[PDB]
């Protein structure tokens with residue numbers, strides 16, 4: 001069905017790599033083009049969890065489920081107030097897989113890279129332009145040679161700049177904001193907070209500020225602090241830790257000294273406005289050549305209720321199935337069938353995550 005043709009996947013994130021695996025095991029000629037300089041670039045961020053109905057099915061189909069298990073870490077969850085423990089959910093043996101053991105993002109990338117043929121991924125390839133010819137797409141990469149493909153699949157994350165051939169829809173700010181950071185040797189550097197987590201992930205919520213932490217992302221503590229974007233903003237400079245620290249200490253002034261120590265001990269902060277790529281309009285039905293989008297490039301949405309990578313791993317599973325099992329007259333029809341399913345579960349996910357974002361940031365999230 002892709003028989004004399006090649007596929008370009010733009011983006012080597014967890015969705016794009018998984019797309020590449022599911023394609024390539026059915027004999028399809030696929031390359032992944034990834035902006036990262038090389039395979040050891042550090043991926044900033046929290047862990048990912050794969051769920052039994054969805055992301056784990058992608059891994060199962062790719063023959064990687066067990067490997068995901070070996071490298072992932074089941075974790076309990078503690079809910080605390082702006083000082084003490086209000087709920088402690090330890091993981092039980094029936095449930096350690098039950099979905100969603102946590103995996104570090106570089107571990108998962110390495111699992112997916114290792115399952116691919118040599119030179120599937122081409123590193124240091126930032127796609128900046130796409131142009132449809134007669135039969136193939138010309139792909140333009142910053143300061144590197146151009147390439148062609150019969151089929152382009154954008155897997156290049158929520159801020160993709162190269163969507164216009166699929167849709168004119170734009171990314172939108174949802175009105176919340178997230179500040180993230182990593183603390184190394186947390187047992188040493190934020191002891192009181194590290195002891196509160198006590199090996200579990202921790203969430204706490206107070207007066208419209210939410211705090212999420214994982215004390216054990218390959219030995220580093222990762223945390224995020226989220227809140228409704230201040231009307232005043234922008235006004236904090238994430239380059240200057242002092243201005244981020246002043247802002248956070250003001251917002252957290254009520255909170256126990258263990259949380260403040262977390263803010264004090266952080267070397268640098270990454271600030272990011274929450275965004276959604278809304279599945280609001282149908283995508284374009286006149287496309288000059290086959291092209292589609294999966295993962296956050298298709299349906300970026302707030303992460304607060306756990307939605308995120310699982311639905312992108314389902315995208316990969318449904319699209320590769322449609323392209324391989326070839327029950328369709330054409331690639332075009334294969335893509336359209338995928339996009340139709342994806343609009344349904346993708347909209348359900350977005351509604352739940354928008355509704356959850358509203359519910360959480362209500363300043364009186366009791367909750």
Ligand SMILES: Cc1cc2nc3c(=O)[nH]c(=O)nc-3n(C[C@H](O)[C@H](O)[C@H](O)COP(=O)(O)OP(=O)(O)OC[C@H]3O[C@@H](n4cnc5c(N)ncnc54)[C@H](O)[C@@H]3O)c2cc1C
Nearest residue numbers: 011012013014015034035126127156157295296303308309
């Ligand atoms: C703060 C926060 C916490 C989150 N927590 C969770 C969670 O707990 N659970 C969950 O499931 N999801 C969570 N998510 C969502 C989750 O991270 C994403 O859904 C997931 O990473 C998307 O996978 P992806 O492959 O589509 O995109 P990405 O991970 O964004 O990867 C896209 C890849 O494309 C590469 N790329 C970008 N531009 C180009 C270019 N022009 N050319 C070539 N390559 C390019 C990038 O380097 C990147 O490797 C969270 C998101 C945020 C923001």
